[PDB]
Amino acid sequence: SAFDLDVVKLTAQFVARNGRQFLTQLMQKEQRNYQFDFLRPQHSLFNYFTKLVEQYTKILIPPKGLFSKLKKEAENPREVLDQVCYRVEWAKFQERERKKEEEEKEKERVAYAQIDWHDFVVV
Amino acid sequence: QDATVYVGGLDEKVSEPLLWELFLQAGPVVNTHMPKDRVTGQHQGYGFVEFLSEEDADYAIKIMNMIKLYGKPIRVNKANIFIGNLDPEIDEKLLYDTFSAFGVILQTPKIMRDPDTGNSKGYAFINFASFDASDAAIEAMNGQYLCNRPITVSYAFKKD
Amino acid sequence: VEVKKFVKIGRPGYKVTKQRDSELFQIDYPEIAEGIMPRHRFMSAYEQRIEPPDRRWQYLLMAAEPYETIAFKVPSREIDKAEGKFWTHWNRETKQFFLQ
């Protein structure tokens, strides 16, 4: 699976340098008798190819290392510790929201299994 | 166990030489075994066919899969929701794909097997993500037409 | 048992509007001031309070806690899906219930 991953990485690297949505280096390759089944969204590898293209677009950011240098993430452990604490707080908030959604689903299941299903009215 | 193929879904018309005669076109079936019950004294629908080579058993498993033998879903294989009267031709991944249309599955499902053969017992247990998927399985899947086998979905544990 | 006995039933008049779509009913309900969404379920006509003859159809009924259940008979076998989490919606800002 190394050759398909390398082809997907090459397609994500060639598609990230495009100046338009449809005017890319992979749309013209489809008409140039080159078989590429990862371009269609019906395949399961397209969801990974889209994430690879998003990572290639995020590797081209101006704070990603092209024309600037990161100082907080590279020369401050306290900022990294604060970011890790904020990520842990966001994960705890997401777990609390998932627990609240599970409690709401359990309450809706308890309310649906206790209602009267014999009082039918056709208007 | 590798050269033998476990067949599931045999009716009363199928017999011990009948399975060897039906599996003779697939490969050289050397022996046929049918475990008899203790209360009824007949076959429980599951049997085994021991052939000579493993390629003949693989061809019999790939040829006689999900067949309609004696009005029964006969299939050969390599030897809180409860689902009963399920076909042995389906696997755990096939049951997970069939259960994915109604609701979301929490993990991989498991099917009960016999302690003697180990192919298919007849009942299975599957767990859903929430109670809405269990209610949709008890409303729609509890009585749906499966592969030549009327399944029945029910609740494993319920508190009044 | 505790939630079923404490459920108040005054049976108000509901307002359902059906529309034949192609690719959906809209039930106007008052403010319930609770997090419990109204649930829809498809049942058979075999069980009734008086058991009328020639009952061989199905009915999809939507029910809530402060309001009465509104039921619509479906003569067809399967033309849609009566699942709650699949093709239903309940906007609590406008209190509008939709099911398709």
Curated annotation (Swiss-Prot), chain A:
The protein here is known as Splicing factor 3A subunit 1
- Organism for this UniProt entry: Homo sapiens
Q: Where is this site: Critical for binding to SF3A3?
A: 10
Record note on domains: SURP motif 2 mediates direct binding to SF3A3.
Q: What does the subunit comment say?
A: Component of the 17S U2 SnRNP complex, a ribonucleoprotein complex that contains small nuclear RNA (snRNA) U2 and a number of specific proteins. Part of the SF3A subcomplex of the 17S U2 SnRNP complex which is composed of three subunits; SF3A3/SAP61, SF3A2/SAP62 and SF3A1/SAP114. SF3A associates with the splicing factor SF3B and a 12S RNA unit to form the mature 17S U2 small nuclear ribonucleoprotein complex (17S U2 snRNP). SF3A1 functions as a scaffold that interacts directly with both SF3A2 and SF3A3. Identified in the spliceosome 'E' complex, a precursor of the spliceosome 'A' complex.
Q: Where in the cell is it found?
A: Nucleus; Nucleus speckle
Biological role stated in the UniProt entry: Component of the 17S U2 SnRNP complex of the spliceosome, a large ribonucleoprotein complex that removes introns from transcribed pre-mRNAs. The 17S U2 SnRNP complex (1) directly participates in early spliceosome assembly and (2) mediates recognition of the intron branch site during pre-mRNA splicing by promoting the selection of the pre-mRNA branch-site adenosine, the nucleophile for the first step of splicing.
Q: In which tissues is it expressed?
A: Ubiquitously expressed.
| Source organism, top-level taxon | Eukaryota
Curated annotation (Swiss-Prot), chain B:
Q: Name one GO molecular function term.
A: RNA binding
Q: Which residues form the RRM domain?
A: 3-79, 80-158
Q: Cystine bridges: which residues?
A: none
The answer on whether this UniProt entry bears the keyword Nucleus reads yes
A Gene Ontology biological process noted in the UniProt record is: mRNA splicing, via spliceosome
Q: Does the keyword Nucleus apply?
A: yes
Relate the protein's function as given in its record.
Component of the 17S U2 SnRNP complex of the spliceosome, a large ribonucleoprotein complex that removes introns from transcribed pre-mRNAs. The 17S U2 SnRNP complex (1) directly participates in early spliceosome assembly and (2) mediates recognition of the intron branch site during pre-mRNA splicing by promoting the selection of the pre-mRNA branch-site adenosine, the nucleophile for the first step of splicing.
Please report the name of this protein according to its UniProt entry.
Splicing factor 3B subunit 4
What is the source species?
Homo sapiens (Human)
Q: Which residues of the full protein are shown?
A: 11 to 181 of 424
From Swiss-Prot, chain C:
Question: Where can this protein be found?
Answer: Nucleus
Q: Which residues cross the membrane?
A: none
Q: Give residues where Phosphoserine occurs.
A: 44
Top-rank taxon: Eukaryota
Q: How does it assemble?
A: Component of the 17S U2 SnRNP complex, a ribonucleoprotein complex that contains small nuclear RNA (snRNA) U2 and a number of specific proteins. Part of the SF3A subcomplex of the 17S U2 SnRNP complex which is composed of three subunits; SF3A3/SAP61, SF3A2/SAP62 and SF3A1/SAP114. SF3A associates with the splicing factor SF3B and a 12S RNA unit to form the mature 17S U2 small nuclear ribonucleoprotein complex (17S U2 snRNP). Identified in the spliceosome 'E' complex, a precursor of the spliceosome 'A' complex. Identified in the spliceosome 'A' and 'B' complexes.
Q: What does this protein do?
A: Component of the 17S U2 SnRNP complex of the spliceosome, a large ribonucleoprotein complex that removes introns from transcribed pre-mRNAs. The 17S U2 SnRNP complex (1) directly participates in early spliceosome assembly and (2) mediates recognition of the intron branch site during pre-mRNA splicing by promoting the selection of the pre-mRNA branch-site adenosine, the nucleophile for the first step of splicing.
The family note in this entry says: Belongs to the SF3A2 family.
Which protein is depicted? Answer: Splicing factor 3A subunit 2
The species this protein was found in = Homo sapiens
The taxonomic lineage of its organism, from the top, reads: Eukaryota, Metazoa, Chordata, Craniata, Vertebrata
